[PDB]
Design an enzyme around this catalytic site. Structure first.
Site, PDB file in Angstrom:
ATOM      1  N   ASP A 181     -70.727  27.708  41.745  1.00 31.77           N
ATOM      2  CA  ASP A 181     -70.706  26.421  42.426  1.00 31.77           C
ATOM      3  C   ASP A 181     -69.513  25.506  42.188  1.00 31.77           C
ATOM      4  O   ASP A 181     -68.843  25.104  43.134  1.00 31.77           O
ATOM      5  CB  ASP A 181     -71.971  25.626  42.108  1.00 31.77           C
ATOM      6  CG  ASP A 181     -72.025  24.321  42.880  1.00 31.77           C
ATOM      7  OD1 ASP A 181     -72.184  24.379  44.116  1.00 31.77           O
ATOM      8  OD2 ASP A 181     -71.889  23.243  42.263  1.00 31.77           O
ATOM      9  N   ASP A 229     -68.992  25.266  36.718  1.00 34.63           N
ATOM     10  CA  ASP A 229     -70.033  26.054  36.071  1.00 34.63           C
ATOM     11  C   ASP A 229     -70.195  27.380  36.811  1.00 34.63           C
ATOM     12  O   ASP A 229     -69.412  27.699  37.713  1.00 34.63           O
ATOM     13  CB  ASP A 229     -71.355  25.286  36.061  1.00 34.63           C
ATOM     14  CG  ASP A 229     -71.818  24.898  37.456  1.00 34.63           C
ATOM     15  OD1 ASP A 229     -71.077  25.165  38.423  1.00 34.63           O
ATOM     16  OD2 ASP A 229     -72.920  24.323  37.578  1.00 34.63           O
ATOM     17  N   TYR A 284     -78.712  19.286  42.359  1.00 34.68           N
ATOM     18  CA  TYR A 284     -78.599  19.127  43.798  1.00 34.68           C
ATOM     19  C   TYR A 284     -79.933  18.706  44.381  1.00 34.68           C
ATOM     20  O   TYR A 284     -80.669  19.516  44.955  1.00 34.68           O
ATOM     21  CB  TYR A 284     -78.095  20.425  44.433  1.00 34.68           C
ATOM     22  CG  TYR A 284     -76.612  20.638  44.210  1.00 34.68           C
ATOM     23  CD1 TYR A 284     -75.669  19.932  44.957  1.00 34.68           C
ATOM     24  CD2 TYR A 284     -76.151  21.494  43.211  1.00 34.68           C
ATOM     25  CE1 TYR A 284     -74.298  20.071  44.711  1.00 34.68           C
ATOM     26  CE2 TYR A 284     -74.782  21.639  42.955  1.00 34.68           C
ATOM     27  CZ  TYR A 284     -73.864  20.921  43.710  1.00 34.68           C
ATOM     28  OH  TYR A 284     -72.514  21.049  43.457  1.00 34.68           O
ATOM     29  N   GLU A 303     -63.678  17.479  37.773  1.00 33.09           N
ATOM     30  CA  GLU A 303     -64.346  18.697  38.198  1.00 33.09           C
ATOM     31  C   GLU A 303     -63.939  19.090  39.614  1.00 33.09           C
ATOM     32  O   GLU A 303     -63.425  18.269  40.376  1.00 33.09           O
ATOM     33  CB  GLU A 303     -65.868  18.586  38.072  1.00 33.09           C
ATOM     34  CG  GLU A 303     -66.567  19.934  38.311  1.00 33.09           C
ATOM     35  CD  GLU A 303     -67.952  20.022  37.682  1.00 33.09           C
ATOM     36  OE1 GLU A 303     -68.651  18.989  37.646  1.00 33.09           O
ATOM     37  OE2 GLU A 303     -68.343  21.128  37.238  1.00 33.09           O
TER      38      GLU A 303
HETATM   39  O1  LIG Z   1     -73.971  17.753  34.930  1.00 31.51           O
HETATM   40  C1  LIG Z   1     -72.664  17.225  34.758  1.00 31.51           C
HETATM   41  C2  LIG Z   1     -71.686  18.304  34.322  1.00 31.51           C
HETATM   42  O2  LIG Z   1     -72.156  18.828  33.061  1.00 31.51           O
HETATM   43  C3  LIG Z   1     -71.248  19.781  32.489  1.00 31.51           C
HETATM   44  O3  LIG Z   1     -71.768  20.201  31.272  1.00 31.51           O
HETATM   45  C4  LIG Z   1     -71.661  19.283  30.163  1.00 31.51           C
HETATM   46  C5  LIG Z   1     -73.062  18.811  29.750  1.00 31.51           C
HETATM   47  O4  LIG Z   1     -73.639  18.043  30.796  1.00 31.51           O
HETATM   48  C6  LIG Z   1     -72.986  17.966  28.475  1.00 31.51           C
HETATM   49  O5  LIG Z   1     -74.296  17.629  28.042  1.00 31.51           O
HETATM   50  C7  LIG Z   1     -72.267  18.753  27.377  1.00 31.51           C
HETATM   51  O6  LIG Z   1     -72.139  17.963  26.245  1.00 31.51           O
HETATM   52  O7  LIG Z   1     -70.950  19.117  27.822  1.00 31.51           O
HETATM   53  C8  LIG Z   1     -70.975  19.986  28.978  1.00 31.51           C
HETATM   54  C9  LIG Z   1     -69.536  20.373  29.272  1.00 31.51           C
HETATM   55  O8  LIG Z   1     -68.747  19.231  29.570  1.00 31.51           O
HETATM   56  C10 LIG Z   1     -71.091  20.986  33.423  1.00 31.51           C
HETATM   57  O9  LIG Z   1     -70.129  21.880  32.886  1.00 31.51           O
HETATM   58  C11 LIG Z   1     -70.640  20.534  34.815  1.00 31.51           C
HETATM   59  O10 LIG Z   1     -70.646  21.644  35.702  1.00 31.51           O
HETATM   60  C12 LIG Z   1     -71.563  19.433  35.351  1.00 31.51           C
HETATM   61  O11 LIG Z   1     -71.031  18.913  36.561  1.00 31.51           O
END
Ligand SMILES: OC[C@H]1O[C@@H](O[C@H]2[C@H](O)[C@@H](O)[C@H](O)O[C@@H]2CO)[C@H](O)[C@@H](O)[C@@H]1O
Ligand SMILES: [Ca+2]
Ligand code: NI
Ligand SMILES: [Zn+2]
Length: 431
Positions: free
Chosen positions: A56, A59, A204, A410
Site C-alpha cells: 500500500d 508498509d 482505511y 510517506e
Molecule cells: O499509521 C501511521 C503510520 O505508522 C507507521 O508505523 C509507525 C507506528 O505507527 C508507530 O507506533 C511506531 O512507533 O513507528 C512506526 C514506524 O514509524 C507505518 O509504518 C506507516 O505505514 C503508517 O502510515
C-alpha cells in the site's frame, strides 16, 4: 520555471510502482535492482493464491480500497490521455503496471461471488521495519467480500479498474481483456447485491459506497453500451443524500474514499443532465476560492497527503478540459503540477528522483533499506525511490524531511495514481 519536463516526470511517476510490487514476480522487469520476490505465500491460510498486487504505502499490507482506487485512476489516465503515453514511450511500462494490478484482482476472485481484498494486518505489519523480501511468516487474508459480507466501495473500484483494463487492453490481448470485463461485471453485481462499505481497519475507514457504485457503472456502460448501468448509476450516486433536490456539493476531491466528483463528471458526459454539471461546477468553483492557498501557491485541502489531493483535483480538471476548454482550470492545474515539480518556497521537487533537492528520508521500508536496530531507520534512505510523490509541506510551505513525520514523508499508491494522470494531462495541454 519557464519550461517543465512533464515527459520525464510522467516516466518517473509510472516507474514508482515498481518499488511496491509484491509477490514472486515482483522483481520481473523491475527497474529497481533492490527489489525482489516477497510475501510469496500470501493466501495460503485460506487455500487461495493471493500473491501479487502492491504494498500500500511505506508498509507492506495490501489494503483493498486504496488498491482498487489506484488501479482505476491509473487506468483512467491511460484511457483519457493515451497519446501522452504513446508519444513519450511510456505506454508499454504503464500497461505493465496496470496488468500487475489486474492479475492480482483476478486471482482474488476465485469464484463469481467471492473477492479477497486485504492481505496482512496493519497493526502487526507496522511493528516491523526491514526489507519486504525478508519479512517472513504467513500473512492473514484478513478480509473477504461475499454474499454475507459487504464491500460495495472496494468491489466497485476494483470493478472500474478491470473495465478500464478491458478498454485499454482489448487491442493487445482481447482474451485477457474480456477476462477482466467478465470479472468487472461480477464484482459490480456483488457490490450492488449487499450494500455496505468494506473493511480497512483503522487505516482505511470508509464512509461511502454510492459514489463508487455509480463510478463503476459508468465504465460498464462505456464498455457494453447497456444503458441499464446508467439507470443504476443515477440511483446509486444519490444514496444517503439528504440534501435539497439531491444537490451534490463535494467540498473534498477525488480520493480512495470519495469518488463523487469523478462519478458526476462521467454522468455529466453520458447523460448531459444539469444536476451533474452543477455538482462538477460546484467542486471546481469551491477549489478556485474556498480551498486554502499557501503563500507559495499550493491548494491546501488538509494536513495529510496534501499534494496527493492537489494532484487528484488537477487531474479531474484536465480530463474535464478535453471537451470543455476552461483556461481558469488549465491555469490552476498547471500551477499545482509545477509546484510539485519544484516551483515552491522550499525549492524542492516533491517527486523523489526528479528535479532537485528531493526528500531523502522517505517513509518507505524497502527504499529506506535499514532496520529499527540502532534507529538506523532514521538515516537517509539507502535507495532512490524514483517517482514517488511525498506527503508534502505544511500550510506555510515548510517541509520537514524526517521519516518519523509520516505526514510529510510517506508515499503511497493512491498518491501516485493521481500524479500519473495529471502529468499525462499536462503533456497533452502544455506539451
Ligand atoms: O499509521 C501511521 C503510520 O505508522 C507507521 O508505523 C509507525 C507506528 O505507527 C508507530 O507506533 C511506531 O512507533 O513507528 C512506526 C514506524 O514509524 C507505518 O509504518 C506507516 O505505514 C503508517 O502510515
Ligand atoms: Ca467512497
Ligand atoms: Ni515553472
Ligand atoms: Zn510483498
Amino acid at each position: 520555471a519557464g519550461t517543465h519536463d512533464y515527459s520525464t516526470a510522467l516516466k518517473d511517476s509510472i516507474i514508482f510502482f515498481d518499488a511496491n510490487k509484491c509477490g514472486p514476480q515482483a522483481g520481473e522487469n523491475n527497474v529497481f535492482d533492490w527489489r525482489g520476490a516477497c510475501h510469496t505465500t500470501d493466501g495460503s491460510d485460506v487455500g487461495v493464491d493471493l500473491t501479487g498486487g502492491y504494498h500500500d504505502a511505506g508498509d507492506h499490507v495490501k489494503f483493498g480500497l486504496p488498491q482498487g482506487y489506484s488501479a482505476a485512476i491509473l487506468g483512467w489516465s491511460l484511457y483519457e490521455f493515451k497519446e501522452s503515453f504513446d508519444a513519450t514511450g511510456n505506454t508499454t511500462k504503464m500497461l505493465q503496471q496496470l496488468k500487475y494490478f489486474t492479475d492480482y484482482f483476478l486471482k482474488s476472485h476465485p469464484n463469481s461471488t467471492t473477492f479477497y481484498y486485504q492481505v496482512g494486518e496493519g497493526n502487526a505489519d507496522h511493528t516491523y521495519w526491514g526489507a519486504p523480501e525478508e519479512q517472513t511468516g504467513q500473512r492473514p487474508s484478513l478480509y473477504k467480500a461475499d454474499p454475507s459480507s459487504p464491500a460495495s466501495d472496494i468491489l466497485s473500484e476494483t470493478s472500474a479498474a478491470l473495465t478500464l483494463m478491458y478498454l485499454n487492453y482489448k487491442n493487445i490481448d482481447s482474451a485477457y481483456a474480456t477476462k477482466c470485463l467478465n470479472a468487472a461485471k461480477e464484482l459490480y453485481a456483488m457490490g450492488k447485491a449487499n450494500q455496505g462499505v468494506g473493511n480497512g481497519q483503522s487505516f482505511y475507514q470508509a464512509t461511502s459506497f454510492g459514489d463508487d457504485l455509480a463510478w463503476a457503472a459508468t465504465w460498464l456502460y462505456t464498455a457494453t453500451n447497456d444503458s441499464t448501468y446508467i439507470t443504476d448509476a443515477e440511483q446509486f450516486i444519490t444514496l444517503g443524500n439528504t440534501m435539497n433536490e439531491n444537490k451534490m456539493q463535494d467540498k473534498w476531491t477525488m480520493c480512495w474514499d470519495d469518488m463523487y466528483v469523478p462519478a458526476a463528471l462521467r454522468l455529466a458526459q453520458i447523460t448531459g443532465k444539469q444536476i451533474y454539471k452543477d455538482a462538477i461546477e460546484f467542486n471546481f468553483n469551491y477549489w478556485k476560492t474556498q480551498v486554502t492557498t499557501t503563500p507559495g501557491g499550493l491548494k491546501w485541502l488538509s494536513n495529510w497527503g496534501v499534494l496527493r489531493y492537489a494532484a487528484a483535483e488537477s487531474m479531474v480538471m484536465l480530463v474535464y478540459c478535453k471537451q470543455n476548454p476552461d483556461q481558469s482550470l488549465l491555469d490552476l492545474a498547471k500551477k499545482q503540477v509545477d509546484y510539485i515539480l519544484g516551483d515552491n518556497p522550499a525549492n524542492m521537487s516533491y517527486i523523489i528522483g526528479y528535479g532537485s533537492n528531493w526528500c531523502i528520508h522517505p517513509h518507505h521500508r524497502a527504499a529506506n533499506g535499514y532496520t529499527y536496530a540502532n534507529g538506523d531507520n532514521a538515516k537517509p534512505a539507502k535507495h532512490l525511490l524514483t517517482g514517488a510523490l511525498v506527503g508534502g509541506p505544511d500550510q506555510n510551505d515548510k517541509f520537514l524531511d524526517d521519516a518519523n513525520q509520516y505526514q510529510y514523508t510517506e508515499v503511497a499508491l493512491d498518491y501516485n495514481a493521481g500524479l500519473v494522470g495529471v502529468l499525462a494531462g499536462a503533456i497533452k495541454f502544455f506539451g
